[PDB]
């Protein structure tokens, strides 16, 4: 009955993983075994996507979320995002799936056979939650491991192939990065931008040099923070600010994960640089801008002077001014004039869309991209009927951008709730009234009435 | 022992499922309302009544199946199986909508049975019948929506059909023809249902977060014995919490649980009154003062006028197929539409 | 002690009639700015060009509205998601025209209500309570964030946030049904089960506890005086309401643990309102309600309408009329 029942551990079956709070060895098993499942899914899913992949359809017509992640790192893909070698996808898949079994093996070992608790078997792997120095030491090691990870990405971009650059000319190509941006005025300029329209905070990063640069900074930041924490212990002010318990640490990371899920949601919805629309489908803004382009082109071909066409409201039917005067597409898409993409920027001048470039320099690849993106706009039904809510059945499509955003908003919301739940409970638990109010000492009863 | 008293003994026996005298009404009518819904959604069409498929057999799923209302041409017929329309022909009775009245009417007598059952059980157990009283609101809703409303209209066609999406259609019909959202009786109903849910959540959360520590484990559910004398949570600390968070608080446990009965029961009753109104097309559709201004001032626009424009879209776009017996033919050119769309 | 400690101890005093707390330090100013602005705009704000098409909607009482039709109107579509503080406008006149009070109100309000949630945790801590009331409030809070913040974000404009008005709300719902078939979305179905179920269980619990009040009064006084505040004992016979309700249905569809019963009351409406807040939040990214338009066809290929097709005809009626001057191009892609 080594914990494992409600009578001894104090927790019912529906909260049984709480039985593991002070069993460092079994708890180690659960984490690795769970790490097992993550890598497993990275593996199974990729092979499933590979088995289901037709290279003639866009990635985004086929319901793929992981292969687009592999293509962005510059594997298996050529100019315009054309798939030229599928074998790297197979490798990413098999290796993770294989790896999951060793992970699998290791977690099931520790959770069952291994020592329930580690702290008497080795003073180094054992830990107590309240050991402030040991905790920052673990934090410190994982910081360094993360710092290395970020530098793997730099390594791939600068030395091992490059990344897919949607903005690379000739419709996009894989490209090695040689002048990453290290100016902290840029790298940390991003963190100071407004998250509101036209700025977008870090979601606005629109070039690979800034991406690769930022991961140099973060890699060295992390490695340097690992060391700092391995060598230091928290100071007086920090000690008095936090709860030092296993549950509180959990609650702080649920807090972080939630924040991150939310940023990911907006990243995949607005950003078309590290989520190239070649792979992920167009953004919502991009599709809506693409429609205005499409019908500008068609009408202008018919003889319409699109710069002087007054639509019903008195505003331009095709072109109007943003509130700061930029020439932007008209109609409802006026809200999306912040959009930028490689198919559209050739028509941009200092004052925004340039009418001479509109009347002369629109190439057919731009008409194709604009028509393609307008008919793959991220709208679709739960059962993957594509289009507006009133569309008839026929097109089996829902944008990967919808899938990844909706899923990760849901997950971020529930991880915020998890924060409040465990943060609240950590505080009560630490103060000792998490099982309820002491009848013989009820605090309100020592307090004066309010009135 | 008279035979009436012997039968009373057996009917009021302590068994796993209590019968009672109420049961003689309750169980047959509920089983057949239920059973007729299951039967009709699984196997029966709405093709001759509505121009619609409505069963699993026809390839509908759980959201789109319905036992649909009989054709408008039936008027308010009871649609008895042995009646002039179907003449005892069970197949024809399904096709003309008999199951709808079959469900509607057995369902109604089942609800009666259920309320009587609440009275019957309260009386034998010795408790006040506030639960039966509370169930008056579901009854007013059912009666107002499924019976009164069509009896005011041209026929049972316009009552709700018994299906998930059929009921969604009814919601949207009610927006576009009745402007129901604007009706203070519905607004009182909204308040009482959303306020009921608020009371539900805030009272449960308050009890669970003012518990006394009456055991020693972290699962606090085991620290309660239904025979204890004691309050399992602190009214005193709950009161202070809410007086300081929200300004005012309950202090009286009786008024608190009475208020929980009152709020949602009172809201469903208000909504019912509004639907009785709509039985007669007695709607709160317009604000005259807005329309007199709007008609004279083409620059005057409010969310009220914008919503009527939506309403007009619903009526014209949905009526031909929604009321097929009318043979509405709307050439493209009459269909109200904004620019481009 | 020193001045800073006096202040800290006042901020966190469990003796103030209204608890302040550190969350309260942010909440109070933000809710006050939001309430004053809203009250003044609702009464006197001039028309607002919500859809960016120079077609202003009058929302305020002095400009021809009543309580039911009035609203603080969402900011201009021309603005989209740009931050539009008063200081970004050339003049208050411009700010009013373009819908600036809306931004000011909802930002201060989201902020103020988030701190309200935190404040609920904070006082439960000072009082020795369990902390999870604030979790319950997270369902309503998340719902507000959805209609005011998340849905604008995914759609690219606060012009499509929910208006601060009774009829504005209806407008929002109708346009939402046509653009997302929210009625056919399970998360919204889960919201209705949440709030119907919450109302049902509200009425049940109230009726069941009320049914089993212990006679402590006479037929002339209010039954409510049978309960005295802070009384040690219970004033109703839960055993008796279990016995009544277990027989109404059967013995085990009924609760006899007060704590399990009350946790069920908390959890049902909170969960479902979480789901429907999550429904508005994911339709915000155009993952929409089930589409069964022309899902049944016959052996030749004729469409055999179902009730889902009838809903589509309504939806389509909303689609083509809403914002009747705002679309130049055939698809309403946001």
């Amino acid at each position: 009955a080594t914990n494992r029942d409600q009578e001894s551990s104090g927790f019912a079956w529906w909260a049984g993983n709480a039985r593991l709070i002070n069993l460092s060895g079994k708890l180690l098993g659960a984490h690795v075994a769970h790490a097992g499942l993550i890598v497993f899914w990275a593996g199974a899913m990729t092979l499933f996507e590979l088995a289901h992949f037709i290279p003639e359809k866009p990635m985004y017509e086929q319901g793929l979320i992981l292969i687009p992640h592999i293509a962005t790192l510059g594997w298996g893909v050529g100019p315009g995002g054309e798939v030229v070698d599928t074998f790297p996808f197979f490798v990413v898949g098999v290796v993770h799936l294989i790896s999951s079994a060793v992970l699998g093996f290791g977690g099931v070992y520790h959770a069952i056979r291994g020592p329930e608790t580690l702290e008497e078997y080795s003073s180094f792997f054992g830990y107590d939650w309240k050991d402030k120095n040991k905790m920052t030491t673990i934090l410190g090691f994982h910081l360094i491991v993360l710092g290395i990870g970020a530098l793997l990405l730099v390594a791939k971009a600068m030395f091992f192939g490059g990344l897919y650059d949607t903005w690379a000319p000739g419709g996009g190509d894989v490209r090695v990065i040689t002048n990453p941006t290290l100016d902290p005025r840029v790298i940390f300029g991003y963190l100071l931008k407004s998250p509101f329209g036209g700025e977008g905070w870090i979601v606005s990063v629109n070039n690979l040099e800034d991406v690769v640069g930022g991961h140099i900074w973060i890699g060295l930041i992390c490695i340097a923070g690992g060391i700092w924490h391995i060598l230091t212990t928290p100071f007086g002010w920090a000690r008095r600010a936090f709860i030092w318990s296993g549950e509180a640490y959990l609650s702080y990371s649920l807090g972080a994960l939630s924040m991150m899920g939310f940023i990911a949601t907006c990243f995949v919805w607005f950003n078309n640089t590290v989520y190239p629309s070649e792979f992920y489908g167009p953004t919502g803004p991009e599709a809506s801008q693409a429609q205005a382009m499409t019908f500008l082109i068609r009408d202008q071909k018919l003889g319409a002077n699109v710069g002087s066409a007054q639509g019903p409201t008195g505003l331009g039917k095709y072109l109007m001014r943003s509130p700061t005067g930029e020439i932007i597409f008209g109609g409802e898409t006026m809200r999306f004039w912040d959009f930028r993409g490689p198919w559209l920027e050739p028509l941009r001048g200092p004052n925004g869309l340039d009418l001479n470039k509109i009347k002369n320099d629109i190439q057919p690849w731009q008409e194709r991209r604009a028509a393609e993106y307008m008919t793959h706009a991220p709208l679709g039904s739960l059962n993957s009927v594509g289009g507006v809510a009133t569309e008839i059945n026929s097109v089996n499509f829902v944008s990967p951008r919808s899938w990844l955003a909706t899923s990760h908003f849901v997950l971020a919301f529930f991880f915020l709730v998890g924060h409040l739940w465990h943060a609240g409970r950590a505080r009560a638990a630490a103060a000792g009234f998490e099982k309820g109010i002491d009848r013989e000492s009820e605090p309100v009863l020592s307090m004066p009435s309010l009135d | 022992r008279g035979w009436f008293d012997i039968l009373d003994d057996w009917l009021k026996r302590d068994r796993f499922v209590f019968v009672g005298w109420s049961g003689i009404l309750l169980f047959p009518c509920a089983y057949l309302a239920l059973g007729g819904w299951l039967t009709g959604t699984t196997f029966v069409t709405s093709w001759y009544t509505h121009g619609l498929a409505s069963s699993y057999l026809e390839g509908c799923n759980f959201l789109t199946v319905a036992v649909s209302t009989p054709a408008n041409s039936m008027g308010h017929s009871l649609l008895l199986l042995w009646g002039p329309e179907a003449q005892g022909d069970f197949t024809r009775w399904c096709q003309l909508g008999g199951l709808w009245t079959f469900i509607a009417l057995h369902g109604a007598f089942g609800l009666i049975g259920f309320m009587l059952r609440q009275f019957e059980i309260a009386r034998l157990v010795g408790v006040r019948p506030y639960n039966a009283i509370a169930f008056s609101a579901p009854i007013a809703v059912f009666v107002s929506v499924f019976l009164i409303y069509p009896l005011g209209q041209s026929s049972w066609f316009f009552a709700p059909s018994f299906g998930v999406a059929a009921i969604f259609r009814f919601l949207l019909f009610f927006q576009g023809f009745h402007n129901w959202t604007l009706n203070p009786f519905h607004m009182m109903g909204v308040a009482g249902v959303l306020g009921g849910a608020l009371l539900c959540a805030i009272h449960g959360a308050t009890v669970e977060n003012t518990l006394f520590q009456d055991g020693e484990g972290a699962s606090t559910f085991r620290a309660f014995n239904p025979t204890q004398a004691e309050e399992t949570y602190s009214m005193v600390t709950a009161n202070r919490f809410w007086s300081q968070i929200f300004g005012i608080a309950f202090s009286n446990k009786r008024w608190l649980h009475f208020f929980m009965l009152f709020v949602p029961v009172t809201g469903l009753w208000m909504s019912a009154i509004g639907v009785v109104g709509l039985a007669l097309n007695l709607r709160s559709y317009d604000f005259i003062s807005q329309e007199i201004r709007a008609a004279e001032d083409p620059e005057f626009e409010t969310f009220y006028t914008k919503n009527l424009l939506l309403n007009e879209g619903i009526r014209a776009w949905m009526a031909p197929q929604d009321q097929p017996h009318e043979n509405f033919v709307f050439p493209e050119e009459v269909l109200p539409r904004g620019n481009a769309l | 002690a020193n001045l800073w400690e006096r202040f800290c101890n006042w901020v966190t005093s469990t003796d103030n009639r209204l608890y302040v707390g550190w969350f309260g330090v942010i909440m109070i100013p933000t809710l006050l700015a939001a309430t004053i602005c809203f009250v003044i705009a609702f009464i006197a704000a001039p028309p607002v060009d919500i859809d960016g098409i120079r077609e202003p909607v009058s929302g305020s009482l002095l400009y021809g509205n009543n309580i039911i039709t009035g609203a603080v109107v969402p900011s201009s579509n021309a603005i989209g998601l740009h931050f539009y503080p008063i200081w970004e406008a050339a003049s208050l006149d411009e700010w009013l025209y373009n819908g600036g009070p809306y931004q000011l109100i909802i930002f201060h309000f989201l902020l103020g209500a988030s701190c309200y949630m935190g404040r609920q945790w904070e006082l439960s801590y000072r009082l020795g309570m369990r902390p999870w009331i604030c979790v319950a409030y997270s369902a309503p809070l998340a719902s507000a964030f959805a209609v005011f913040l998340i849905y604008p974000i995914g759609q690219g404009s606060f012009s499509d946030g929910m208006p601060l008005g009774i009829s504005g709300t209806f407008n929002f719902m109708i346009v939402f049904q046509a653009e997302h078939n929210i009625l056919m979305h399970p998360f919204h179905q889960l919201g209705v089960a949440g709030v119907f179920g919450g109302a049902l269980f509200c009425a049940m619990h109230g009726s069941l506890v009320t049914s089993s009040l212990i006679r402590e009064t006479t037929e002339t006084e209010s039954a409510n005086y049978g309960y005295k505040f802070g009384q040690e004992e219970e004033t109703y016979n839960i055993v008796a309401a279990h016995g009544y309700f277990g027989r109404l249905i059967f013995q085990y569809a009924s609760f006899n643990n007060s704590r399990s019963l009350h946790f069920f009351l908390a959890a049902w409406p909170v969960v479902g309102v979480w789901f429907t807040a999550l429904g508005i939040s994911t339709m915000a990214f155009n993952l929409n309600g089930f589409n069964f338009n022309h899902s049944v066809i016959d052996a030749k290929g004729n469409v055999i309408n179902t009730w889902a097709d009838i809903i589509n005809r309504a939806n389509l009626g909303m689609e083509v009329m809403h914002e009747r001057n705002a679309h130049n191009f055939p698809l309403d892609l946001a």
């Binding site: 309010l450 | 005012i248 | 009639r17 009464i43 505040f229 009384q231």
Partner: peptide
């Protein structure tokens, strides 16, 4: 006159809030 009427009722309710909070029946423990 209609604007004034809506504002007056609204103002009465805000005054009610005040008295309901600050001049409530104090709850006491008997």
């Amino acid at each position: 006159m209609e604007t004034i009427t809506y504002v007056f009722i609204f103002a009465c309710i805000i005054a009610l809030f005040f008295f309901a909070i600050f001049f409530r029946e104090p709850p006491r423990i008997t």
